[PDB]
Amino acid sequence: ARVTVQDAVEKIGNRFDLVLVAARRARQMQVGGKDPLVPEENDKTTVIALREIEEGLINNQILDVRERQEQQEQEAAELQAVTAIAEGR
Partner 1 sequence: LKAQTKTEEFDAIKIALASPDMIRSWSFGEVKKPETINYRTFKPERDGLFCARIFGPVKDYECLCGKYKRLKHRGVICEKCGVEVTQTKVRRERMGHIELASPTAHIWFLKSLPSRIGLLLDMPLRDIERVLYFESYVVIEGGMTNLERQQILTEEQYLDALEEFGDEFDAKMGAEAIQALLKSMDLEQECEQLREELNETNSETKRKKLTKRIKLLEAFVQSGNKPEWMILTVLPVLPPDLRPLVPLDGGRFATSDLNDLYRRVINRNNRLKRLLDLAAPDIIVRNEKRMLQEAVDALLDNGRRGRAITGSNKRPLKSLADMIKGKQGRFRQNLLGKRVDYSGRSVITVGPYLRLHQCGLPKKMALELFKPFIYGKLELRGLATTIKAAKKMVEREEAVVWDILDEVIREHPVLLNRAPTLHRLGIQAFEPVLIEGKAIQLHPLVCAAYNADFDGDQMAVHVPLTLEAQLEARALMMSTNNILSPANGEPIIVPSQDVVLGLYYMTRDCVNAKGEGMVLTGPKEAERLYRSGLASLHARVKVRITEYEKDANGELVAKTSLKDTTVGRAILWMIVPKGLPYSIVNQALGKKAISKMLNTCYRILGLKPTVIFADQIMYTGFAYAARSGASVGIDDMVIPEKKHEIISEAEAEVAEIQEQFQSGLVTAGERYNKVIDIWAAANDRVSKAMMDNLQTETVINRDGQEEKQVSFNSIYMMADSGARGSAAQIRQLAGMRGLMAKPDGSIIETPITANFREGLNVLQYFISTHGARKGLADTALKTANSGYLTRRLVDVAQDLVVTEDDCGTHEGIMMTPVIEGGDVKEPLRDRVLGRVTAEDVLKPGTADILVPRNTLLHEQWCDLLEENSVDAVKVRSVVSCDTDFGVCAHCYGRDLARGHIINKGEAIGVIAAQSIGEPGTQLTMRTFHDITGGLPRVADLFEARRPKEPAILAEISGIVSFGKETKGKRRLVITPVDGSDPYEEMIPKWRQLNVFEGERVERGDVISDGPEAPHDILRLRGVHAVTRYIVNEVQDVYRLQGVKINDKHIEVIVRQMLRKATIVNAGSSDFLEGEQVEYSRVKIANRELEANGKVGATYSRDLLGITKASLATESFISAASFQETTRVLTEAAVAGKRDELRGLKENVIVGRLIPAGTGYAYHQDRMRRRAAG
Partner 2 sequence: HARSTGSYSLVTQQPLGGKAQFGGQRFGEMEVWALEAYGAAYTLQEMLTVKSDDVNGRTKMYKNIVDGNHQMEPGMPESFNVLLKEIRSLGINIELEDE
How far is the C-alpha of 47 from the C-alpha of 29, rounded, in Å?
11
Binding mask 44-73 for partner 2 (x = CB under 8 A): ------------------------------
Does 50 contact partner 1 by CB under 8 A?
A: yes
**What's the closest the beta carbon of residue 8 comes to partner 1, in angstroms?**
8
Residues in the chain: 89
Picking from 60, 38, 58, 59, the residue whose alpha carbon sits closest to that of residue 48 is 38
What sign does the dihedral 15-20-24-29 (CA atoms) show? positive
Does 34 contact partner 2 by CB under 8 A?
A: no
Binding region for partner 1 (CB under 8 A): 2-9, 13-20, 22-23, 26-27, 30, 42-47, 49-50
